[PDB]
A paper describes a structure:
Of these, kust_36903, hereafter designated Ks-Amt5, uniquely features an extended, cytoplasmic domain with high homologies to histidine kinases (HK) of the HisKA subfamily. Ks-Amt5 is a 679 amino-acid protein organized into an N-terminal ammonium transport (Amt) domain connected to a C-terminal domain of 269 residues. Ks-Amt5 represents the prototype of a modular sensor-transducer system that evolved from the widespread ammonium transporter role to serve as a specific receptor for the NH4+ cation. We find that the canonical ammonium transporter module in Ks-Amt5, has been repurposed to selectively bind ammonium cations in a binding pocket that is not present in orthologues described previously.
Ks-Amt5 crystallized in space group P63 and crystals diffracted to a resolution better than 2 Å using synchrotron radiation. The structure was solved and refined to 1.98 Å resolution, but only the transmembrane Amt domain was well defined in the electron density maps. The detailed atomic model covered amino-acid residues 1–405 up to the beginning of the helical connector between the two domains. From here on, the quality of the electron density map deteriorated due to structural disorder of the HK domain, and although various features such as extended helices were discernible, an atomic model could not be built. The transmembrane domain of Ks-Amt5 follows the Amt/Rh fold, aligning to A. fulgidus Amt1 with a root-mean-squared deviation of all-atom positions of 1.2 Å. As expected from primary structure alignments, all known functional motifs are retained, including the selectivity filter (W144, S227), the Phe gate (F103, F223) and the His pair (H171, H326). Here, two ammonium cations are tightly coordinated by a network of residues, namely Q24 and E31 from helix h1, N47, D50 and T51 from h2 and T109 and T112 from h4. The observed binding geometry with five ligands on each cation is distinct from the octahedral symmetry commonly observed for Na+, and the short bond distances of 2.2–2.4 Å are in excellent agreement with calculated and observed coordination distances of water to NH4+, making the assignment unambiguous. Ks-Amt5 thus diverts the substrate cations that have passed the selectivity filter (W144, S227) into high-affinity binding sites, where binding may lead to structural rearrangements that trigger signaling.
Numbering used by the authors:
A (entry chain A), B (entry chain A), C (entry chain A): 1 to 405
The structure:
């Protein structure tokens, strides 16, 4: 009876998890599409490799730090190596564990596209290990450490922080880590001219980026729907809202991009779609389809503004607009929780939207400070023992080097 | 008890819907594969864009026209913007809504491949909006307007019209709209020679079209299985029949194409596979696996004959054979309902196959007259304010223009 | 109650089956990626065609031979054409049938990559028909003929042979058939030099092989999870173990390949990942996640050693390392059942690991003798009436010939 509902809940969570695994393929296509053709091999391989690393690091330590027994709402201290997962009374056990593993893989893979084309291999693999072992799961404990282990909470959740599926926990966290990495690696050699103007580099396979967007969008259905952690009538609502945020983000982008540039530029249209997906991840279980449309519209435009600001004003070179999609998109969705969520979902102690907005903002700032700041430190310390970039000669020839024999 | 079965039914419908969403990627690959390499960008982008448009138009008006409260079995008059979806006693609510949205996206995206390579952007996006707002959901009301809202029916269904998953409602409707659009746009510039002979243009990425076929076939599992709208033992039957129709269609094609052309031509083999899929969509819940095999065999050959007739006798230039796959394939499947369906499924008032055949034929003719005729009018009226084709220079250079900076 | 659990069990098995269908696309991408660009068309088409053939042959005879009423634990003798499937009391009927069909398609498609680039069409299609009609389903009866039809068993299962999801039944069987075919076709013309050294041929689309690996890995979730044939809490365990075997196989490979070749070679990294997947298929329901990690680590390295042995010592030319992934990987996983499986799962009559190891080894040797030996005979007899290879001129020009008009 209850045992049959538990079985259905396993089925859905594990199916959703598999859909989220398939986002790993999404990111691989998207990033390869956005890349210069001479680097397509390296970027395909980094994306496969990071999935290997993230799985093992999250199995060994990440899950425990994130969801194990809480030390002061700060960090988890058991469930390393999935120790005694099956003894926990939390009904979803391995299904929950795998679901959260593929979340961690999502957070970590954001990196590769932000430092593509000129970073070396070691910064990628070591970056992956670091985000998955430290940055991601400790923030995750703060935000979500109430979810698995009995009778505990993370300090941010205790204050009333809301992030349904990880706009901040996955996407902003990964995006700010990527942003530090992009800064410390530096721009691609021919990105900026001596007058400060920006060149368009890459996007040599628009069809492949398009296929990437579809895979990502499909996967986000599991990302969002699976985050219910159970099957109810609500499942159709969450997925419909996810779809509507993506679609509205795209349409707002088509309009804004035509009006302001007199053509449809593929790069910015994708950015906007994916940013809307990221944004709706914060709130898709607690908003109406019309609010999902509004969140998409607002996120689509703001993400494109951000993408241009990052590129041309901050002069951070982000070949896939990862910082705009995941970092900024997650901030926007996370803040929108306060504006749009059904009032019964608010956790702010006084019950108000104003107060929830301040808690959401606090979560946003803490996520930035933790992930960008530790990421800066991590890449500063790495740079001291291994150069972060490849040589300029390698950069012009292409990272696809070894397959020439 | 019943509440647990309702939960399982949501789970399946929403999973199926997500599989059908992934057909959008299928069509993108298939069409890009069938295209000339110089146009691959435009076709990838049109396919993504139409998904944005179809989602929002169907959310706003299409669903209401199709499934809302019936005015005389002719058109629905509420459930615009999903108004009060949750209050309906129809148990599937949002899940049903999203399922039917991705059906609408399927119907609309058929267009792009039929007018690829020489139509301009506006005819595509405006065509999408028109099919999704008017043609598709009003015919859908006629055929399926009994399905969601309590105690009503569409006039065609009232006469006993059967289409399980949309051989006519999705595929023929979309295919006849595409056929009007292909006619009004006209053929590609170098398609036909001065002696009337046909050139083979495009299909520059057979591997990508192959991947497209697999995605489509996979998605059709959800398209058909999900149309049960509930989980039963019948789910394996529907999917097995879908598979067997595709496989038989392909084998019949391999045989017929070898016998008549002394080589395996990839284009026609794909046409046949997809046409068999389209055909089995009418009846996969009501036939045996052996009848699914017969439907596939018959559809495979007839679709290839049709594809050649359309191309070389009607001189309609259809770069992906959309009219043959979706238009003709849907007619064949829809007629086969009368021939092959289990007698308990027939709705013809007198209970007979002859009479069901006449009702199926009537549905077929009405679908044609409505979708081809309104499509002709729509593109005639559009042409009066915006030329439907690009300039010949643009056509020879390739629609992939803006990505050259 | 029990009827609702039966419905959930259908849902999962059919979903898993659809995921396994999508492996067909996986193999198509993987093999196309590993191929020389001039042959990509032929390999895409062979992979689509084999899915057509395997479906129909397995529907007609394979399923009956494999799962029908047992004649002496040797071969099944009913359920041809799915005759009376619905009357069987085995609760999963069509769902089970389709699940096992896509297993058969997996076994058969292994062939194409092993003889790619220089075999002709007929050896491929006839090979497919033969493996699906004879080799696969008769061995399948021996190993699994207890599973569907009431009160019977296959002789190997009777001795206590264990293969959860088909490390031997699918993968080794298909891999040894492929190995015979590769031998009888002979090596690609420029594979080996006059001094016996090996050239690297192909792998012209590493990104596409990467996408192939992800699809395969995703599909293996269904392959393994679906093999529970029911939904329980165990579903998360099986999928988590599948993931962990792949990830460990990849990491072990990164380490071993760096240490021994001072670079990451993409081909061997993929080989190892897929071999780990194959291996964990034998035991994913009966091992802990840490043992899945050990199985992956061991399989990853041994598969790479094997791949080199096959190529450079046996001088069998296997363009996708199918023999190493599927043949050797399946042997390793099948033997590991005895080493790692939870003791309650062992079937060896005396209850011991030593004894189970001897039964697993016996299954391994019988699978080899049957599939390699009949495959040798089959291709010897075929060669007598149709040459197995294309002409050297065709081989240098590329099998992609007919699409040039
Ligand atoms: C769970 C954790 C275990 C996983 C362990 C996996 C083992 C990994 C094998 C090591 C592979 C090293 O791979 C190698 O790294 C270095 C450092 O970035 C890269 O080097 C690159 O950056 C350096 C620094 O400016 C350049 O000088 C060099 O010319 C350039 O190629 C190599 O291009 C890359 O080939
Ligand atoms: C829910 C609905 C809201 C969605 C609104 C989306 C906003 C859309 C932005 C408008 C984009 C217009 O895009 C533009 O259209 C025109 C008209 O077909 C195309 O124009 C093409 O056809 C014309 C007509 O012969 C040719 O003269 C022209 O040389 C050729 O390029 C452009 O090639 C295309 O770039
Ligand atoms: C359920 C079962 C029913 C399925 C039936 C399907 C019908 C199949 C149509 C037959 C197609 C034959 O396809 C054809 O086969 C032959 C034999 O390998 C190939 O021939 C190849 O090998 C031969 C033998 O050395 C070479 O001489 C030839 O030059 C080379 O091209 C052709 O390249 C291929 O085009
Ligand atoms: C929160 C903190 C976010 C801000 C982080 C700073 C980002 O990186 C920083 O580093 C960038 C390197 O290219 C920029 O430096 C220059 O690099 C160009 C040549 O590549 C040239 O065109 C610029 O005008 C020159 O100033 C920039 O000076 C700075 O903006
Ligand atoms: C139901 C109604 C279906 C029929 C619709 C008619 C289809 O379109 C119609 O338009 C077509 C334009 O190419 C054809 O016109 C010609 O275009 C070729 C040069 O491109 C040349 O080779 C032909 O011989 C010449 O007649 C055709 O004359 C007609 O068949
Ligand atoms: C269990 C049974 C497994 C073993 C099966 C035997 C495999 O095939 C067999 O056939 C192979 C053809 O290339 C090999 O023959 C040669 O082919 C090369 C030129 O292409 C040359 O470099 C070699 O040195 C020459 O001997 C090999 O002599 C043999 O190993
Ligand atoms: N990844
Ligand atoms: N990535
Ligand atoms: N689309
Ligand atoms: N399309
Ligand atoms: N296949
Ligand atoms: N294959």
């Amino acid at each position: 009876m209850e045992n049959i509902q538990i079985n259905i809940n396993h089925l859905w969570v594990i199916m959703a998890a598999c859909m989220v695994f398939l986002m790993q393929l999404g990111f691989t296509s998207y990033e390869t599409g956005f890349s210069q053709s001479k680097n397509a091999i390296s970027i395909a391989l980094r994306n496969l490799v990071d999935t290997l690393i993230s799985s093992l690091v999250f199995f060994s330590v990440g899950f425990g730090f994130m969801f194990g027994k809480s030390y002061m709402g700060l960090i988890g201290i058991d469930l390393f190596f999935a120790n005694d997962l099956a003894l926990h009374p939390n009904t979803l056990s391995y299904s929950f564990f795998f679901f959260q593993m593929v979340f961690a893989s999502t957070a970590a893979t954001i990196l590769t596209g932000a430092i593509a084309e000129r970073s070396g291999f070691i910064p990628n693999i070591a970056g992956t290990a670091f985000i998955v072992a430290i940055i991601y799961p400790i923030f995750g404990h703060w935000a979500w450490g109430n979810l698995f282990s009995p009778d505990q909470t993370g300090w941010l959740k205790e204050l009333g922080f809301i992030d349904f599926a990880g706009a901040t926990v996955v996407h902003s966290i990964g995006g700010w880590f990527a942003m530090a990495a992009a800064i410390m690696v530096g721009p691609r050699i021919d990105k900026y001219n001596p007058d400060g103007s920006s060149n368009r580099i890459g996007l040599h396979n628009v069809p492949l980026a398009t296929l990437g967007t579809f895979f990502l969008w499909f996967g986000w259905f599991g990302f969002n729907g699976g985050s219910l952690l159970r099957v109810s009538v609500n499942i159709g609502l969450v997925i419909l809202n996810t779809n509507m945020a993506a679609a509205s983000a795209g349409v707002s982008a088509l309009i804004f991009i035509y009006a302001t540039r007199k053509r449809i530029e593929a790069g910015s249209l994708f950015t906007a779609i994916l940013a809307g997906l990221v944004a709706i991840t914060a709130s898709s279980n607690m908003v109406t389809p019309v609010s999902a449309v509004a969140i998409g519209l607002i996120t689509g435009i703001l993400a494109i503004i951000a993408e241009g600001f990052i590129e041309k004003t901050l002069k951070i070179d982000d070949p896939v607009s990862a910082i705009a999609v995941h970092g900024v998109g997650g901030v926007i969705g996370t803040l929108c929780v306060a504006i749009f969520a059904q009032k019964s979902y608010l956790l702010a102690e006084n019950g108000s939207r104003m107060h929830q907005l301040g808690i959401q903002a606090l979560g946003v700032i803490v996520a930035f400070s933790w992930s960008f700041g530790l990421g800066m430190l991590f890449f500063l310390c790495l740079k001291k023992v291994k150069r972060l970039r490849v040589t300029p000669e390698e950069e012009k020839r292409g990272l696809n080097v070894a397959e020439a024999a």
